[PDB]
């Protein structure tokens, strides 16, 4: 099926405390495999999945230097964005960056993306054509002009279509027994009385992978897909016999229909 | 596999 590698970055400036708090995480589909924390003691990229630990020290050395360069750029960005908007030097601010590449069923390049935010608001983003930037305001238009000067979109386009995809195939291959093995949701139903005439039936979906799943009572109330803590996911949908629990997941050859009994 | 340091500042 389709797969994706995504990287998330967060740098929170702290006035009077020197270096901003830089945190980075990497994902392969709904699985985190690398992390970095500027406040950690190792001061290097650390694995977060068993299969990624098959890489020698040469891999972790280059990834540690590259993630430290990302923090060095976000540090200058926070200082520049403070001047672009003319903000106080005693206030805290946040910059967030995310990018990644997706592949299809043939494991060839499908789409890429890159977004940047400041204080939780959209700042600049790469368009789907991977050749133009969408600027939010005048400060972002200055940045778009700055990036169009050195053709940053051309260099990022070459990474998403080449290096990002090739290493995604290597991650899927080395993580074959986990990244390519779907987990079917273990299903059970619960019944409760909430009114003098109406009741509530809650359909549970637990311990499934990937995270995407659809639960509806078609011819309601459902919460967000939450992590169980062991790599799997959880979700439930409730309603207060014209509609039953329709469970649809990639790990099920046919959808599951359950009714109270 | 992180990309190279080709992104300049803002």
């Amino acid at each position: 099926g389709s797969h994706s590698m995504r990287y998330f970055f967060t740098s929170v400036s702290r006035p009077g405390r020197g270096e901003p708090r830089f945190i980075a995480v990497g994902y392969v589909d709904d699985t985190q495999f690398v992390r970095f924390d500027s406040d950690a003691a190792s001061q290097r990229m650390e694995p977060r999945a068993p299969w990624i630990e098959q890489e020698g020290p040469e891999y972790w050395d280059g990834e540690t230097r590259k993630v430290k360069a990302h923090s060095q750029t976000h540090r200058v960005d926070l200082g520049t964005l403070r001047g672009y908007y003319n903000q106080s030097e005693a206030g805290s601010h946040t910059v967030q960056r995310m990018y990644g590449c997706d592949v299809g069923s043939d494991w060839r390049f499908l789409r890429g993306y890159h977004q940047y935010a400041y204080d939780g608001k959209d700042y600049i983003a790469l368009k789907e054509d991977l050749r133009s930037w969408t600027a939010a305001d005048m400060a972002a238009q200055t940045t778009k002009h700055k990036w169009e000067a050195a053709h940053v979109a051309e260099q990022l386009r070459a990474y998403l279509e080449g290096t990002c995809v090739e290493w995604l195939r290597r991650y899927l291959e080395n993580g074959k027994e986990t990244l390519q093995r779907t987990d079917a949701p273990k299903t059970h139903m619960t019944h409760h009385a909430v009114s003098d005439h109406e009741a509530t039936l809650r359909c549970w979906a637990l311990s499934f992978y990937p995270a995407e799943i659809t639960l509806t009572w078609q011819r309601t109330e459902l919460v967000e897909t939450r992590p169980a803590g062991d790599g799997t996911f959880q979700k439930w949908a409730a309603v207060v016999q014209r509609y039953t629990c329709h469970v649809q997941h990639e790990g099920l050859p046919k959808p599951l229909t359950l009714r109270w009994e | 596999f992180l990309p190279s340091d080709f992104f300049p500042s803002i």
Partner: antibody
Framework: EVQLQQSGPELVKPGASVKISCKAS????????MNWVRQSHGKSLEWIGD????????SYNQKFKGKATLTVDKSSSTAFMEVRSLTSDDSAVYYC???????????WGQGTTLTVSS | EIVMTQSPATLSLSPGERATLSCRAS???????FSWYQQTPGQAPRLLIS???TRATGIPARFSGSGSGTDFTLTISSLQPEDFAVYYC?????????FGQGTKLEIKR
């Protein structure tokens, strides 16, 4: 061969305005940003600003916001810089440096000497 | 504004020796946006080394660059008659783009 032909020297009086031209040839003009750099006598270099030759978009050094203005003409492949309200401190050598596709100033003009005196 | 500082101001060496020039940046700069320039008195500057280490088109193989973070270095393998001029460093990494104060290479006699 990339060739940046600039204008000749100019002696002007204070409070006047001069306009330097920079003729580009030997490459695709719309593929590279054009920058402008000033160098005073016995002094180092200072980036004034750049201009996108496709849409005329510009960025400036904060010191030159209101002193120099950048324009381009895609027809003749020429980049212009107009320096207004000239004083004796504006007397220097001005260059137009092409921006490399991925960075740096890969090619420079021969320079244009400006002198502001009464 | 990232400030670039070069050391020393003047460097007296003899034809045929190595030359190591330093450029300290006040802030961390990506090596992909650091450059070296040579300017002979009377002429215009010329790009020598881009990307902290990549040699520009037409620059002799005796010029080599390195460095990272806040410390960059320009190396000349063998000082030749033309290689006695003023050398500048710059950053195109954060607006405004800034240069260094320069470093003159003087013939030692």
């Amino acid at each position: 061969e990339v060739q940046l032909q600039q204008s000749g020297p100019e002696l002007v009086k204070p409070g006047a305005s001069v306009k330097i031209s920079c003729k580009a040839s030997g490459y695709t003009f719309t593929d590279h940003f054009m920058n402008w750099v000033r160098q005073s006598h016995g002094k180092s270099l200072e980036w004034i600003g750049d201009i996108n030759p496709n849409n005329g978009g510009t960025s400036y050094n904060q010191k030159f916001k209101g002193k120099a203005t950048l324009t381009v003409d895609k027809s003749s492949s020429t980049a212009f810089m107009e320096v207004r309200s000239l004083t004796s401190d504006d007397s220097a050598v001005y260059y137009c440096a092409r921006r490399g596709y991925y960075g740096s100033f890969d090619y420079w003009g021969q320079g244009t000497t400006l002198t502001v005196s009464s | 504004e990232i400030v670039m500082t070069q050391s020393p101001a003047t460097l007296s060496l003899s034809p045929g020796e190595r030359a190591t020039l330093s450029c300290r940046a006040s802030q961390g700069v990506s090596s992909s946006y650091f450059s070296w320039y040579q300017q002979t008195p009377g002429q215009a500057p010329r790009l020598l080394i881009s990307g902290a280490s990549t040699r520009a088109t037409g620059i002799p193989a005796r010029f080599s660059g390195s460095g990272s973070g806040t410390d960059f270095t320009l190396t000349i393998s063998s000082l030749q008659p033309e290689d006695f001029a003023v050398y500048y460093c710059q950053q195109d990494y954060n607006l405004p783009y800034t240069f260094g104060q320069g470093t003159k290479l003087e013939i030692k006699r």
